[PDB]
Write an enzyme that holds these catalytic residues in place. Structure first.
Site, short mmCIF file in Angstrom:
data_model
loop_
_atom_site.label_atom_id
_atom_site.label_comp_id
_atom_site.label_asym_id
_atom_site.label_seq_id
_atom_site.Cartn_x
_atom_site.Cartn_y
_atom_site.Cartn_z
N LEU A 44 0.87 -1.18 -0.02
CA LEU A 44 -0.06 -0.05 0.03
C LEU A 44 0.91 1.42 0.17
CD1 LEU A 44 -3.15 -1.11 2.13
CD2 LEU A 44 -3.04 -0.99 -0.35
N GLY A 45 2.08 1.29 0.54
CA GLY A 45 2.84 2.57 0.82
C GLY A 45 3.86 2.03 1.99
N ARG A 46 4.44 3.28 2.38
CA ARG A 46 5.31 3.55 3.54
C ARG A 46 5.22 4.53 4.32
NH1 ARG A 46 7.73 2.85 -1.61
NH2 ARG A 46 9.02 4.49 -2.49
N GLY A 47 5.98 4.86 5.33
CA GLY A 47 6.01 5.83 6.21
C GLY A 47 7.30 5.96 6.82
N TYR A 49 8.57 5.05 9.70
CA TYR A 49 8.91 3.99 10.70
C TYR A 49 8.27 2.60 9.93
CZ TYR A 49 9.71 8.37 13.14
OH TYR A 49 10.17 9.47 13.66
N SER A 50 7.61 2.55 8.84
CA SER A 50 7.08 1.36 8.33
C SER A 50 6.83 1.06 6.83
CB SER A 50 5.68 1.53 8.96
OG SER A 50 4.61 2.42 8.48
N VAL A 52 3.60 -0.47 4.45
CA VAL A 52 2.26 -1.00 4.85
C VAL A 52 1.80 -1.85 3.50
CG1 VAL A 52 1.89 1.10 6.16
CG2 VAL A 52 0.02 0.38 4.52
N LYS A 67 0.91 -2.73 8.87
CA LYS A 67 1.60 -1.62 9.23
C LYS A 67 2.88 -2.68 9.90
CE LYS A 67 2.10 2.82 11.40
NZ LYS A 67 1.93 3.59 12.33
N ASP A 155 -0.50 14.47 14.41
CA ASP A 155 -0.02 14.06 13.09
C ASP A 155 -1.47 14.34 12.11
OD1 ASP A 155 1.70 14.07 11.00
OD2 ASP A 155 1.67 11.69 11.17
C1 LIG Z 1 -1.05 1.93 8.52
C2 LIG Z 1 -0.81 3.47 9.29
O1 LIG Z 1 -0.67 3.78 10.28
N1 LIG Z 1 0.07 4.09 8.24
C3 LIG Z 1 0.02 4.19 6.95
C4 LIG Z 1 -1.40 3.89 6.12
C5 LIG Z 1 -1.12 3.87 4.80
N2 LIG Z 1 -2.46 3.40 3.96
C6 LIG Z 1 -3.42 2.88 4.63
C7 LIG Z 1 -4.58 2.71 3.37
C8 LIG Z 1 -5.71 2.11 3.55
N3 LIG Z 1 -6.89 1.99 2.63
C9 LIG Z 1 -6.61 2.33 1.38
C10 LIG Z 1 -6.04 1.21 0.25
C11 LIG Z 1 -7.41 1.67 0.20
N4 LIG Z 1 -6.07 1.87 5.06
N5 LIG Z 1 -7.37 1.60 5.45
C12 LIG Z 1 -6.93 1.74 6.99
C13 LIG Z 1 -5.82 1.99 7.38
C14 LIG Z 1 -5.12 2.17 8.67
N6 LIG Z 1 -4.74 2.15 9.65
C15 LIG Z 1 -5.17 2.32 6.20
N7 LIG Z 1 -3.87 2.82 5.51
C16 LIG Z 1 -0.02 4.24 3.96
C17 LIG Z 1 1.01 4.46 4.83
C18 LIG Z 1 1.01 4.50 5.98
C19 LIG Z 1 2.45 4.78 6.98
#
Ligand SMILES: CC(=O)Nc1cc(Nc2cc(NC3CC3)n3ncc(C#N)c3n2)ccc1C
Length: 331
Positions: A44-47, A49-50, A52, A67, A155
């Site tokens: 899904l992507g990154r941060g 510290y992670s 995902v 995550k 944040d």
């Molecule tokens: C996990 C976190 O806390 N960070 C985070 C989340 C994402 N991306 C996403 C994307 C989606 N849904 C998109 C795909 C349709 N979802 N749904 C619930 C969460 C949560 N929590 C979430 N997180 C990207 C980057 C970071 C660093």
């Protein structure tokens, strides 16, 4: 003499009245699930510290968000976990479904409910005046709740607001920067995304509180109603304060510095200059006017104040005329 202390206007002692274990996350023992219950589908992507991922819980066939954490202090992991568990079941708060560790890699991963999100850089240009108010009200339910629970998100930005537009469902996510508010505590100002940092972070005033989330929420609202993303477009943390000053004026800034006896970084002295407080009309134009009303502007003004003590609380914000239609429609 040093800075003048500050206390939160509301929910000041909520954590003091709680048993130690509610906020003493350093002593928190993590409850671990089974890692084999989850199979990763795609990234899904990154941060910071992670990394995902989207995953499948094979035991119930449900879609989840995983995550997987990069190296981070165990106490910072305990903090996020504790806050998430404390906020579970709270209005529009992401649900932490599970906590798993790789038996080999020894890497912790947090499992979250999945939100079928429409990327903000596509969704926001399709939102009506009503959509902005409706979704602004939903973030406020989340902020009033976490604040009432002695926690500041720290944040709040478009990226951390997951909206499923088809189901009018909103979730405030990524609680990795969140902290417990304790009267008298001096927090780290190196928090939030540049564009959403409150004046208190920029001037290095450490005794901040929940009011910090109210600033961020104002930056979001300003970007949405004016279709100007970001609204305060700084080149760095110094220029970011200059960008706010060019809108809110330097007078109220120096009044704020005076009030809390803030030691201003000498770098600011030559860049801040002298600027008048601008009227919100200079941000209104033919392609955004349908999103701007006297109610939106009055609400925006009451959020975007240098003095954290003078910003609206999430509860006060929910009572603003801007939300009268949303409030009536929810009954
Ligand atoms: C996990 C976190 O806390 N960070 C985070 C989340 C994402 N991306 C996403 C994307 C989606 N849904 C998109 C795909 C349709 N979802 N749904 C619930 C969460 C949560 N929590 C979430 N997180 C990207 C980057 C970071 C660093």
């Amino acid at each position: 003499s040093g800075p003048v202390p500050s206390r939160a206007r509301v929910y000041t002692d909520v954590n003091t009245h709680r048993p130690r274990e509610y906020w003493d996350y350093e002593s928190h023992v993590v409850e671990w699930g089974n890692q084999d219950d989850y199979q990763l589908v795609r990234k899904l992507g990154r941060g910071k510290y992670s990394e995902v991922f989207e995953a499948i819980n094979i035991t119930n066939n449900e879609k989840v968000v995983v995550k997987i954490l990069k190296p981070v202090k165990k106490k910072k992991i305990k903090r996020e976990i504790k806050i998430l568990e404390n906020l579970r079941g709270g209005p529009n708060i992401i649900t932490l479904a599970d906590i798993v560790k790789d038996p080999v890699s020894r890497t912790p991963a947090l499992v979250f409910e999945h939100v079928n999100n429409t990327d903000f850089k596509q969704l926001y240009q399709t939102l009506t005046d009503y959509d902005i108010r409706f979704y602004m009200y939903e973030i406020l339910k989340a902020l009033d709740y976490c604040h009432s629970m002695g926690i500041m998100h720290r944040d709040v930005k478009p990226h951390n607001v997951m909206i499923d537009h088809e189901h009018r469902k909103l979730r405030l996510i990524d609680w990795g920067l969140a902290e417990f508010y304790h009267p008298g505590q001096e927090y780290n100002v190196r928090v939030a995304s540049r564009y959403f940092k409150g004046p208190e972070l920029l001037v290095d005033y450490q005794m901040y509180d929940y009011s910090l989330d109210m600033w961020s929420l104002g930056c979001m609202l300003a970007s949405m109603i004016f279709r100007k993303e970001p609204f305060f477009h700084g080149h760095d943390n110094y220029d970011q304060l200059v960008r706010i000053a060019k809108v809110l004026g330097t007078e109220d800034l120096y009044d704020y510095i005076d009030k809390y006896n803030i030691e201003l970084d000498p770098r600011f002295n030559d860049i801040l200059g002298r600027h008048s407080r601008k009227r919100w009309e200079r941000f209104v134009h033919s392609e955004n006017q349908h999103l701007v009303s006297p109610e939106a502007l009055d609400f925006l003004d009451k959020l975007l104040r240098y003095d954290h003590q003078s910003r609206l609380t999430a509860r006060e914000a929910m009572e603003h005329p801007y939300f009268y239609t949303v409030v009536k429609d929810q009954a």
